[model samples]
Target chain A: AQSVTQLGSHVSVSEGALVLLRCNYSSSVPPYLFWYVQYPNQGLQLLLKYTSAATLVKGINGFEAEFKKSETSFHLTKPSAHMSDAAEYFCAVSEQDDKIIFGKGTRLHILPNIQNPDPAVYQLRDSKSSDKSVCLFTDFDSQTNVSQSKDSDVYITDKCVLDMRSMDFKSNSAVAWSNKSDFACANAFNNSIIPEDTFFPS
Target chain B: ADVTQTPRNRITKTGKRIMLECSQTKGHDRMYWYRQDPGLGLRLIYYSFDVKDINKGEISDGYSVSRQAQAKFSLSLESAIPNQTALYFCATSDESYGYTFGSGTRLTVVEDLNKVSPPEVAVFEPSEAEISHTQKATLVCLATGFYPDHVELSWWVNGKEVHSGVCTDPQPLKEQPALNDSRYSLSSRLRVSATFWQNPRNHFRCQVQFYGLSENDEWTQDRAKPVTQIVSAEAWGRAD
Candidate 1:
């Protein structure tokens, strides 16, 4: 399992209300933390990064996060939510592998005047991609319509499918950015207790 | 600045074999991004002479490369063949804009014959676009994305498509967000007079496609639209 953990799988807030996406991590040593946002139909954009400089860092679009070593967490927070603020948010830790591994993203939904983001802590658990799965829950009734097929189990609400397979970087160089949503699955699968022999080659 | 060139924006080379390195002394950081147009997305090749301890590009993988002590980094195709045949771009980055991409090199390998001489440089630029706040402009979208050649650029006005002017020669533009490497882009600019502002709600879009490649070939099938909005001084006059 990665050293860090994002405590919440999903969070919802009201438009113009304060919001916080909970995140916690466990590293053998202190880690470089970051927050990235993926807007609809666009590439993953870097929101902010914490590299041993300041504890509180501000990013574009009035977003900020505090890197608390004591808590082993880097939580993204914003003073108020806008409709555009509704997107998948990821918390990541930089590793020596030359990659920034990520947590399962927290889907933030901002409705009109809805305050108090759902208070929940999603512990980064050791799960397998072949066993433990992420079930995307949405208010939209057409859940099965957008559900994952046998090939893909993660559900994507209209956005691009998050591919975390390491080969993705080797397959496509341009868009081979480390995505938090996909990292959550891949890291969990990598950290699973299962033996190596169980993996069937595609 | 040192500059290199390719033919029709393509240079075929082999993989796993030692091919002569090519690059110029241009001050562009987003210059070296290798992308396989048909499939593999964009992968970072290598970056040239950089600051201390940071010569290795931000995202380096697959290909083995070296940046000489003199700041020149060369990419070698250890084993050249058909699989290695893809669109390879060398680019540099800028802070304000994004990336300036070179006419790409299309490397193809059949049988590993004797090591060939260092190939010549081909200086070419793809189509590009630049739009101001107020003007009737058309953006030319011409990036092959993945195929070796035969790419199309279409101009769209208010969501409808339009044809672009013929290109006598290739044009190259520099990349932006210059820090952090991964710079691969081809662009051109179009000028429109500010006085010709009749339709204030007009928007322009540019879309490019490669014939033999998939529908979604990285950044080639991109769409950019910047609208023209006006703030009337008369509204402020009546506010107070």
Candidate 2:
């Protein structure tokens, strides 16, 4: 049997930005991978198929999937995000079987504005302890556990999850980013607040 | 209704015969039935251009189709199964501008009751073996007439199981030539280097394995018999 997993449930990218809807698949033997698009109420349309061929498989429009055996991944990537590119995408895999197995699904949301990718942010925690720490929680999308001392100040997008299990008197951080790359969440705004639910009282 | 679909929804058990109905607006010659499933997208089930001219589709097993009149078309599942549960949508005419589609029927096949059938397998060179005459080489394996749909298919060379660069279509490619062929067919493909495959000493086989019930109700395993084919220029000399 073969199966697939859509890494991102809802992925948002700025128009003209690189669009990568991550997908991973598993099978005991060699298998076929594919990306399909369902636009609105219209019928399904095939985006691309990987029939044990070239690692980089191209499809209609500007979509393509690079099948990487080393990574056990067949991630779909497009050069630029077009407004029309927004749709529901399903990562599928098939071995010698009766039916195709699909991943949970990823909804690609195309942000019209170039400024749409909200800068990455990490709410910092001010503590009396020398090594101050900040906490992160995912409310809008997939849970991205972010943990870093005021020392590291490293902030990442949902694509990369960083978590260091520790005492959780507070899991602070309200302004989680809508986009990637902005290490100045606590610096950009000397202000940050916990969105109530982000903290679990122990 | 130009294109009417009856029984907007149905929930049935396995071993039961359930049929969904479709009626196109008069004069529409081309019609299609597609099943929508998450992640798998829309899979073409069956289509027709005229009465009795049924074209098999990608997912064409456990289910049969009908197009008895210009305005009437239908899909029937003689042996219902859970995986067959999906949104069955009907479309009339072609992509000639706007494609007209019916509201779709929801099928929920229950799994409390179940049945199993073993797969039948075949291995052979394609008609394009003439290409083996040119340069490119390929071996095709087919497994059909089975239930539970899925099966294991592999390729072997010189008795060693070969991995990498092999594909077995997951779509159940069942044909409707005589109607009511509730079995599913799966195809496996292998692409080999021309120099390697064209070697007369080289031997290839497709290993097909099926998992289901047997004669004594214990377990029945079906494996396809091995067939061999040579791809070489000298073999042509042996022709005639």
Q: Which candidate is the best by DockQ?
A: 1
Cα lDDT tens digits, model 2, A1-202, are 4667777667788767999999887786657787877775444466888876687899998788888887789888899987667678887776344334456678786644422112233232221222322322222222323332232223221222111122111111122221224543334322333233332212
Tell me model 2's lDDT, rounded to 2 decimals: 0.56
The regions of model 2 sitting more than 4 angstroms off are A1-86, A89-106, A109-197, B95-98, B113-240
**Per-prediction TM-score, please?**
0.35, 0.36
Worst 10 residues of 1 chain A by lDDT: A169-178
Please report, as a residue range, the 10-residue window in candidate 1 chain B with the lowest summed lDDT. Answer: B231-240
Residue B199, model 1: Cα distance from true site in angstroms: 16
For residue B88, give model 1's deviation from the true position in Å: 10
For residues B1-240, write the lDDT of model 1, one tens digit per residue. 243424323233334464434455645443344443322234445554342323344345445565443324456665555555565655443432233345455554433222211111111111011112112221222221122222334444456653222111121211222322212233222222233213456444444432222222222222321111111100000000
